[PDB]
Structures are given as C-alpha cells and as structure tokens.
C-alpha cells in the first residue's frame, strides 16, 4: 500500500513505445503511426457531408502542431471513420444531436502519423543560426531545435565576426558543418512552436558521495543565464506610474546621467 | 416523474412500474368524449373516416389477432354473467393485456366493447354495422394517451385545481379538503368519522333492521335513567 499508490503514477508518465537507433545511421526513428479515437462536434452546415466536417473542423487544425495525448507532433491523418450511433449495410450513418443546440457529437476513428521524440533520443538538425550563448537548428528542416552554451562542450570556443553573426569552433579547431548531431535533453510543448533543447555532452560519477555534491560554479552559469533571460522578458511591456512632485516637476528614471 | 412509457405502462422517474396501463385502457381524457357518442360518429362517418385516415395505417397494424381474442373473452364473460366475481373464469384475461392498443385493431377496453356492441344491437339503421365497428375501433386507437405524457402532474393538478371550489363549510361525516387531507396528505388510521356501510338482505324488514340498529348502538346507563334521588 506504501508503494502501490505511487505505482499508478509511474505508469501514467511511462514512455509507451521508445524510439530505437537503427540502420547504423546513429539517429533514432521518431515518426510513428498511432490509431486514435476522437469525440468531435459536427456543424449543421456539414450535415450532408459529415466526413469533410470532422476534417475541416478538428483534424486540419491538428496537423503540424503538437498534441499532448499522442505525445508528439501530428504530421497527418489517415483513414477517417465515423462510428454509427446505431449498432447494425449502407454508407448512411447517424449522429446524436445535443438537446439544446443543432450540433451533433460523434465518435471517430482515425490513424495519426506523429513525430514522437522522447529524451535521450539522438537527432540530426541543420544549423539555422549560431549565437555566443546558443546554436539554432532545424530537425527535418521544419522542427525548431536549440543547444544552450552550457549544453555545448567545454573544449569548443565561439568566435564572433566583426565584418557582419558568429561561428562556433569544435575541439579539433575547425568550424562546425551545416548538419549537427545531438541528444534530446528536453522537449518544450507549452509554447507556440515545438522547441527541442539539445545536448552535445554526455550515474557512476560518485567519488565518495562527490556526485551528490553540486559544483556551485557550474550550477550558477545555468541558473544566472536562466534568471537573466526571465527578468529581461518580465521588464518588456511594464507600465510604471508617472510621478509629478509638488513643484510641477516630473520624476524621470534614467540610470545613465549623460547622453 | 410518473409518466406514460413507450410500452404504454405508467412508470415512475426511476423506471418502477406504477400502473400497467393508464386507467386500464390507455385513453387520453382530452380524447374520451365522442368515443361513446356513437350516433354522432355515425352521422359524421365519412367526415371522421377522412379524419382518422386509415390508408396510411393498414400496413402498420394487425386487423384480426385482437378481434378474434375479443370474441373468446366475450364468450367466457357471457358464460359466467350471473356467477359472482370470485367464481368468474380466469382462462382468458382482457384483450388489452395481450395485444398493444396502437398495433392491434380490436384491443379495446371491455367497457368500450360492451357499449359499442350494445349500440349496434339496439340501433338497426350507406354505412354497414361492420364498417362502423371498424371506425370506432380506429377512433379508440387514435384516442390513446401519448408515451411521455406527465400523467402524474396532470393527476395531482386534476385533484388540486377543483378542490379549490370546496373551500366553503357544511350547509356528520368529514367532507371537502379536511376529508381529502385525511386520505391523500396524512393516510390516517384514526379518521374523524369512521363509518361502516352494512347491506341488509331483502328477507329482513324495515322494523327488524331498526331493532337490529338498536341491538348494536352503544347504550349508556344515563340513557335509561329518568331521576336520581340521593337522601
């Protein structure tokens, strides 16, 4: 009973099907086919063409966007099938209408092709941009990926261009090629576009409980840069009150005294 | 919650059966008016035959099953006419108990059946006595209470609304709303005026019955004493 209650939670967050590295490519296959069941609304304008309804209404805004339930980005749908509300041979099916409104609701079966990239998965991306604190990438030239300065190896050194933009140099001492291979550190869904947080560096690091003891110096770089980003953003669109002194003087806030 | 179900029975909100059929015949009161007005229906045969259009119904109903059974029940009913209710035959039960009134032409209440047959016998009158019987059978079919009808509310409203007209006092037994309250509202085991109606025979005379009344009536010592003298 002590571990029985916690066991249900582990199975809720358990990765159903893991992505395997194959064909000596080194990259893990993340595109998967999953058959699903939807409960969708049907508009009265689509009462003569219901399959077009379910498609234009709910399935089309679903593609090229991450869906939390399937645990990936819906690349498309295949084989839509409306479940008849009447258990029974004909193409004429029936859907239950809400007592209050003219809209009907039905169960649907459709197969989804989703891009399901879990953490630990090795992926390849084409370098979009490369700043002093991050490297921009594109998985299959459609999905956004980013490798932060701390996730980049220590041996690597960035070089900023004065002419016009910058470039990162690897351990060997040569600039990085168009395509780059990385491991999935985290996947950010909540935002507008799906962003993959990547790592270029990778349990038994304990030297008499040394792994448990955190190196404050290294832990600071990842926290300070995180806070600096969060605070600068919170200062954007910040409306502060205009204060006028009992003389007719407006109090102007400017850290820099001279021009 | 009490309403008419799609199986014609009177069911409560939770599906529990209250009645197997509304009033035992499934007739809507707002329809049961000219259903016995046979002369009226006869004078307006073709008008009502056009009203209760049977051409769009003949393929959806049965015209013999119930009609045959109605004769079998009438047969055993006539056999035990003089016989008492406890000795009556229980072989064949009513036609409404065996055949759905909205699907079988002839599954009519025995009260309607007796009344209709009596009209055709006592009145010999281009309408045949057989084609008129079908029209009245069809009228009963079209006079059925609709499944879904809130017969529960309608009943309480049909007892409530006219009980406002009896708010005035007496012009012995409890009457009006107090008596209605004794029944419906309190189901009293201790009634204000408990009574018994005793049916007297024919061999017992008016004098004998009055002597019998005296024999049961409570007699007190007070009722026989004229004077008490205490010295």
């Amino acid at each position: 009973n002590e571990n029985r209650e916690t066991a249900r939670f582990i199975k809720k967050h358990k990765k159903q099907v893991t992505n395997p590295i194959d064909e000596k490519n080194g990259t893990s296959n993340c595109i998967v086919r999953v058959p699903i069941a939807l409960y969708v609304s049907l508009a009265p304008m689509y009462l003569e063409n219901p399959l077009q309804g379910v498609m234009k209404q709910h399935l089309n805004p679903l593609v090229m966007k991450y869906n939390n339930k399937v645990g990936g980005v819906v690349l498309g749908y295949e084989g839509l099938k409306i479940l008849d509300a009447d258990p029974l041979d004909t193409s004429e099916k029936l859907i239950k209408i809400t007592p209050d409104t003219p809209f009907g609701f039905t169960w649907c079966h459709v197969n989804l092709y989703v891009w399901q990239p879990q953490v630990g998965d090795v992926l390849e991306g084409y370098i979009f941009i490369q700043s002093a604190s991050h490297i921009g990438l594109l998985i299959h030239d459609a999905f956004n990926a980013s490798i932060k300065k701390n996730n980049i190896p220590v041996d690597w050194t960035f070089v900023h261009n004065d002419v016009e933009l910058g470039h990162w140099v690897d351990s060997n001492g040569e600039p990085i090629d168009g395509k780059l291979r990385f491991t999935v550190r985290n996947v950010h869904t909540t935002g507008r576009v799906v962003s993959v947080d990547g790592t270029l560096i990778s349990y038994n690091s304990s030297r008499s409980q040394a792994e448990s003891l955190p190196i404050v110096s290294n832990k600071k770089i990842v926290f300070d840069d995180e806070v600096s980003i969060e605070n600068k953003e919170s200062h954007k669109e910040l409306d502060l009150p205009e204060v006028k002194e009992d003389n007719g003087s407006e109090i102007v806030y400017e850290e820099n005294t001279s021009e | 919650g009490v309403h008419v179900s799609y199986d014609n029975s009177i069911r409560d909100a939770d599906g529990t059966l209250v009645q197997f059929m509304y009033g035992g015949d499934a007739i809507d009161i707002t329809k049961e008016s000219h259903m016995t007005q046979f002369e009226f229906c006869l004078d307006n045969y073709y008008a009502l035959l056009k009203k209760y259009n049977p051409s769009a119904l003949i393929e959806h109903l049965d015209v013999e099953s119930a009609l045959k059974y109605s004769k079998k029940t009438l047969k055993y009913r006539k056999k035990h006419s003089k016989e008492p209710h406890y000795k009556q035959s229980v072989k064949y039960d009513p036609v409404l108990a065996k055949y759905n009134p909205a699907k079988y032409l002839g599954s009519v209440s025995e009260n309607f059946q007796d009344k209709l047959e009596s009209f055709l016998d006592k009145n010999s009158k281009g309408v045949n006595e057989k084609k008129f019987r079908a029209l009245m059978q069809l009228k009963y079919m079209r006079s059925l209470i609709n499944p879904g009808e809130a017969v529960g509310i309608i009943a309480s409203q049909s007892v409530g609304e006219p009980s406002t007209q009896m708010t005035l006092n007496t012009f012995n037994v409890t009457l009006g709303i107090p008596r209605l309250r004794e029944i419906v509202m309190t189901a009293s085991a201790a009634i204000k005026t408990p009574q018994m109606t005793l049916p007297i025979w024919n061999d017992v005379s008016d004098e004998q019955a009055d002597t019998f009344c005296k024999s049961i009536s409570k007699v007190l010592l007070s009722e026989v004493i004229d004077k008490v003298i205490v010295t």
């Binding site: 003569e48 399959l51 209408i97 007592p99 | 309403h3």
Partner: protein, 47 residues
C-alpha cells in the same frame, strides 16, 4: 429537511442517477418527461 436527507444520502454513499424531474433541474439536465422521453439523431449520408 434538505440537510437531513443529504446526511442519509452521504451515509448510504448513494449515487443520484439524475432520473427524477427534481434531480434533473438541480444539475441542469433536460427533464425525461414528454419531449425529453427520447433522443434526436441526424441521418448523415457520407460513410
């Protein structure tokens, strides 16, 4: 005696099936009498 009947309901661990006119009104469900004694379904042509 709202709180009294509620107490008896909780102690029974009762499930209100929402089949009485009163219960349906409480939860904003359509009454099962008359027009609520059935369901309306739309016939759709495409498979």
């Amino acid at each position: 005696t709202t709180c009294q009947f509620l107490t008896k309901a909780v102690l029974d661990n009762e499930r209100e099936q929402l089949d009485s006119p009163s219960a349906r009104i409480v939860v904003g469900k359509l009454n099962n009498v008359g027009t609520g004694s059935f369901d309306v379904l739309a016939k759709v042509p495409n498979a």
